C-alpha cells in the first residue's frame, strides 16, 4: 500500500 | 493499492 | 487499485 | 480501478 | 474500471 | 467500464 | 506499507 | 513498515 | 519498521 | 477541462 | 484541469 | 490541477 | 497541484 | 504539492 | 510540497 | 517539505 | 523539513 | 529539520 493522507483547516 | 486523500477546509 | 479522494471547502 | 474524486464547495 | 467523479457548488 | 460523472451548481 | 499522515490546523 | 506521522497545529 | 512522529503545538 | 485518455493494447 | 491518462500494453 | 497518470507494461 | 504517476513493468 | 511517484519493475 | 518516491527492482 | 524516498533493489 | 531516505539492497 | 537516513545492503 502507498498513501497519503493530507488535512489541513485554516 | 495507490491512494491520495487530500482535504482542505479554508 | 489507483484513486484520488480530494475535498476542498472555501 | 483507477479513479478520481474531486469535490469543491465554495 | 477508469472513473472521474467531478463535483463543484460555488 | 470508462465513465465522467460531472456536476456544477452555480 | 508506505504512508504519510499531514495534518494542520491554524 | 515506512510512515510519517506529521502534525502541527498553530 | 522505519517512522518518523513529528507533532509541534505553537 | 475534465478527460480520461485511456489506451489499451493486447 | 482534471484528467486521468492510462494505458495498459499485455 | 488533479492528475493520474497510469502506466502498466506486462 | 495533485498527482499520481504509477508506472509497472512485469 | 500532492504527489506519489511509484514505480516498480519485476 | 508532500510527497512519496517509492522504487522497487526485483 | 514532507517527503518520503523509498527505494528496494532484491 | 521531516523527511525518510530508505534504500535496500539485497 | 527531522530527518532519517536508512541504508542496508545484506
Known amino acids: 500500500k ?4 493530507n488535512k489541513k483547516l485554516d
Request: proline share 0%; aromatic share 0%; no cysteine.
Open 2 to 5: 502507498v498513501q497519503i493522507i
